Amino acid sequence: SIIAYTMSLGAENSVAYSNNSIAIPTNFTISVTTEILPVSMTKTSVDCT
Amino acid sequence: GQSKRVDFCGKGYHLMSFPQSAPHGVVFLHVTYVPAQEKNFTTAPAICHDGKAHFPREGVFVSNGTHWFVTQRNFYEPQIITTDNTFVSGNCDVVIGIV
Amino acid sequence: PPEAEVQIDRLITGRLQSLQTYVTQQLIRAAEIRASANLAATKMSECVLGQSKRVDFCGKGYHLMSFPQSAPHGVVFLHVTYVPAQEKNFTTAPAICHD
Amino acid sequence: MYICGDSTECSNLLLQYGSFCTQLNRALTGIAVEQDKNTQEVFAQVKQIYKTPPIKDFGGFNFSQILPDPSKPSKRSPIEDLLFNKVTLADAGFIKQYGDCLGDIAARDLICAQKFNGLTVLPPLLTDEMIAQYTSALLAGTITSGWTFGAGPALQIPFPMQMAYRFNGIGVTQNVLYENQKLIANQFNSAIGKIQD
Amino acid sequence: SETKCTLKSFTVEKGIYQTSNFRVQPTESIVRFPNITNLCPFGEVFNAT
Ligand SMILES: *[C@@H]1O[C@H](CO)[C@@H](O[C@@H]2O[C@H](CO)[C@@H](O)[C@H](O)[C@H]2NC(C)=O)[C@H](O)[C@H]1NC(C)=O
Ligand SMILES: *[C@@H]1O[C@H](CO)[C@@H](O[C@@H]2O[C@H](CO)[C@@H](O)[C@H](O)[C@H]2NC(C)=O)[C@H](O)[C@H]1NC(C)=O
Ligand SMILES: *[C@@H]1O[C@H](CO)[C@@H](O[C@@H]2O[C@H](CO)[C@@H](O)[C@H](O)[C@H]2NC(C)=O)[C@H](O)[C@H]1NC(C)=O
Ligand SMILES: *[C@@H]1O[C@H](CO)[C@@H](O)[C@H](O)[C@H]1NC(C)=O
Ligand SMILES: *[C@@H]1O[C@H](CO)[C@@H](O)[C@H](O)[C@H]1NC(C)=O
Ligand SMILES: *[C@@H]1O[C@H](CO)[C@@H](O)[C@H](O)[C@H]1NC(C)=O
Ligand SMILES: *[C@@H]1O[C@H](CO)[C@@H](O)[C@H](O)[C@H]1NC(C)=O
Ligand SMILES: *[C@@H]1O[C@H](CO)[C@@H](O)[C@H](O)[C@H]1NC(C)=O
Ligand SMILES: *[C@@H]1O[C@H](CO)[C@@H](O)[C@H](O)[C@H]1NC(C)=O
Structure with a gap:
């Protein structure tokens, strides 16, 4: 059935902020993402007669 | 080239990219560096020697x-x-939180 | 009808023309808003989620950081920058000749 | 409604132009959709809603005019609340009932005049409250994990150290910050106060 | 010449111009009516007692 709901804006999270504490990454990964962009559209002409 | 613009060439730190063609457009594969496993460490702005x-x-x-x-x-x-x-530079009486 | 339909058609054509004018203007305005929105999105990534080195992109002076604030129909950015102040005149030289 | 005004004879004559009316709304729909996309492109870049920590020191840096004010009915910062009370909108809700337009004839309310002629204003998908949550998440991130939360995981950094990196970034040695930390925090705090005024 | 008329000019600059469309003309006409041979009852309609 059709349901309605308040949408979620994102996950709940936090940062463990403290005046004398830091986080440093110890490992990493390589990620490759894909970005798709239009460059051109259809070229047209019209015979009005 | 390599851009330093955040999220311009994808999420993460940009390393490189490769174009691929498509009908009426371009598709970019953006290769980025992403920090992974991490740890909690104690810090200090400077050391007092x-x-x-x-x-x-x-x-x-x-x-x-x-x-x-x-x-x-x-x-x-x-x-x-x-x-x-x-x-x-300077001395132990100025920096806050010097260890 | 033999006459009424002429008078009605004059009004229908005229009202459709008014509506087309409206839509065209809204499409043009929408394009301008999109461009503004794309700029705002770019700044969010480059001024808020990172530090830009682009001159006068994130305000005047050397950029340090920024904080977004919302507003009806838009975004307001507070750009925090470093500005050189008191200064002095000194003598210089490209290099030093030693031995 | 705009063209015929419920005249039956006009409505039938207008059928021959139905393809034009359809085209006008396809264009308007396209605009309306883009307006929600624009909002998301600007404010929904980070899908982790980071909470502002109980306030701990930031080394003398006061962010209370940019962070949401918990005493308000809508969790806007003092500056945002000011911005919202300066830009004036055409209406104050999206529900206008027939019975309200019918009763209050004397007002000659332009909103009713627009509705009776078929001109409709639609609500945004993201409400002001949701935008405020996104803005607050970005500030919490910037303040507690400056510029790392936007790259991947959010790694905590003491606020004064984040500033040290910012200073190296513009081009001065970081010892300048620590030696002048009190001054810098005061100049910063003063500038924010001036903006609200 | 078609390009010259379109551009309202006796000089055409280097490039490509569109020039209407390829058209052909009809060469003959065809007339088709059902092969009705009787004349309408004009007499009965207009010459009635
Ligand atoms: C902090 O790091 C140091 C350096 O790795 C650790 O000390 C070394 O521990 C190994 C045994 O695992 C010894 O063979 C080395 O001689 C130690 N080095 C020194 C200078 O003493 C230290 O244990 C780590 N501390 C904690 C709490 O994990
Ligand atoms: C940030 O600055 C504001 C002032 O702009 C501080 O709020 C004031 O706090 C004193 C009590 O110490 C009250 O008497 C004032 O009436 C408050 N002013 C306003 C406008 O509310 C606020 O406490 C400071 N926050 C931090 C973290 O330093
Ligand atoms: C650098 O500039 C700052 C101001 O931008 C100076 O700080 C002020 O110094 C006066 C001295 O009479 C104090 O009364 C003010 O309260 C200080 N302002 C702040 C925000 O703290 C600073 O002294 C200057 N330093 C140098 C070396 O010239
Ligand atoms: C750092 O400490 C906090 C304490 O609340 C903990 O929740 C967090 O997971 C720890 N982070 C790492 C990387 O160990
Ligand atoms: C060690 O730290 C104390 C402050 O806790 C300071 O008074 C002392 O001079 C320091 N000792 C050094 C640099 O040898
Ligand atoms: C962090 O805050 C505590 C008080 O909770 C203080 O004693 C300590 O010196 C502070 N450390 C730094 C680096 O500011
Ligand atoms: C540098 O010298 C010039 C000499 O004309 C003077 O006008 C200027 O004010 C001096 N600048 C500073 C920073 O002292
Ligand atoms: C000092 O400068 C002169 C030129 O004015 C040069 O001839 C001489 O060798 C220099 N002396 C050094 C490097 O000791
Ligand atoms: C009508 O009748 C007259 C004779 O009175 C005749 O001359 C005439 O042609 C008739 N008209 C038609 C259409 O048959």
């Missing part, structure tokens, strides 16, 4: 349960803190 204040040259002062090391910001790789990895 003989009364002089030592600042990290390229990195942060980081400490495990018993020892202080200096590391590059984006990857944990602890070095012995030496006079080569630091610069000296």
Whole structure:
């Protein structure tokens, strides 16, 4: 059935902020993402007669 | 080239990209570096040595349960803190939280 | 009808013309808003989620950081920058001749 | 409604132009959709909603005019609340009932005049409250994990150290910040106060 | 010449111009009506007692 709901804006999270504490990454990964962009559209002409 | 613009060439730190063609457009494959596993370390702005204040040259002062090391910001790789990895300016009575 | 339909058609054509004028203007305005929105999105990534080195992109002076604030139909950015102040005249030279 | 005004004879004549009316709304729909996309492109870049920590020191840096004010009915910062009370909108809700337009004839309310002629204003998908949550998440991130939360995981950094990196970034040695930390925090705090005024 | 008329000019610059469309003309006409041979009852309609 059709349901309605308040949408979620994102996950709940936090940062463990403290005046004398830091986080440093110890490992990493390589990620490759894909970005798709239009460059051109259809070229047209019209015979009005 | 390599862009330093955030999220311009994809999420993460940009390394490189490769174009691919498509009908009426271009598709880019963006290769980026993403920090992964991480740890909680103690820090301090500077080290107090003989009364002089030592600042990290390229990195942060980081400490495990018993020892202080200096590391590059984006990857944990602890070095012995030496006079080569630091610069000296000012003294122990000025920097807040100097250890 | 033989006459009424002429008078009605004059009004129908005229009202459709008014509506087309409206839609065209809204499409043009929408394009301008999109461009503004794309700029705002770019700044969010480059001024808020990172530090830009682009001159006058994130305000005047050297950029340090920024904080977004919302507003009806838009975004307001507070750009925090470093500005050189008191200054002095000094003598200079490209290099020093030693031994 | 705009063209015929419920005249039956007009409505039938207008059938021959139905393809034009359809085209006008396809264009308007396209605009309306883009307006929600624009909002998301600007404010929904980070899908982790980071909470502002209980306030701990930031080394003298006061962010209370940019962070949400918990005493308000809508969690806007003092500056945002000011911005919202300066831009004036055409209406104050999206529900206008027939019975309200019918009763209050004397007002000659332009909103009713627009509705009776078929001109409709639609609500945004993201409400002001949701935008405020996104803005607050970005500030919490910037303040507690400056510029790392936007790259991947959010790694905590003491606020004064984040500033040290910012200073190296513009081109001065970080010792300048620590030696002048109190001054810098005061100049910063003053500038924010001036903006609200 | 078609390009010259379109551009209202006796000089045409280097490039490509569109010039209407390829058209052909009809050469003959066809007339088709059902082969009705009777004349309509004009007499009965207009010459009635
Ligand atoms: C902090 O790091 C140091 C350096 O790795 C650790 O000390 C070393 O521990 C190994 C045994 O695992 C010994 O063989 C070395 O001689 C130690 N080095 C020094 C200088 O004493 C130290 O244990 C780590 N501390 C904590 C709490 O994990
Ligand atoms: C940030 O600055 C504001 C002032 O702009 C501080 O709020 C004031 O706090 C005093 C009590 O210490 C009250 O008497 C004032 O009436 C408050 N002013 C306003 C406008 O509310 C606020 O406490 C400071 N916050 C931090 C973290 O430093
Ligand atoms: C650098 O500039 C700052 C101001 O931008 C100076 O700080 C002020 O100094 C006066 C001294 O009479 C104090 O009364 C003010 O309260 C200080 N302002 C702040 C925000 O703290 C600073 O002294 C200057 N330093 C140098 C070396 O010229
Ligand atoms: C750092 O400490 C906090 C304490 O609340 C903990 O929740 C977090 O997971 C720890 N982070 C890491 C990388 O160990
Ligand atoms: C060690 O730290 C104390 C402050 O806790 C300071 O008074 C003392 O001079 C420091 N000792 C050094 C640099 O040898
Ligand atoms: C952090 O805050 C505590 C008080 O909770 C204080 O004693 C300590 O010196 C502070 N450390 C730094 C680096 O500011
Ligand atoms: C540098 O010298 C010029 C000489 O004409 C003077 O006008 C200027 O004010 C001086 N600048 C500073 C920073 O002292
Ligand atoms: C000092 O400068 C002069 C030129 O003015 C040069 O001839 C001389 O060798 C220099 N002396 C040094 C480097 O000792
Ligand atoms: C009508 O009748 C007259 C004779 O009175 C005749 O001359 C005429 O042609 C008739 N008209 C038609 C259409 O048959």
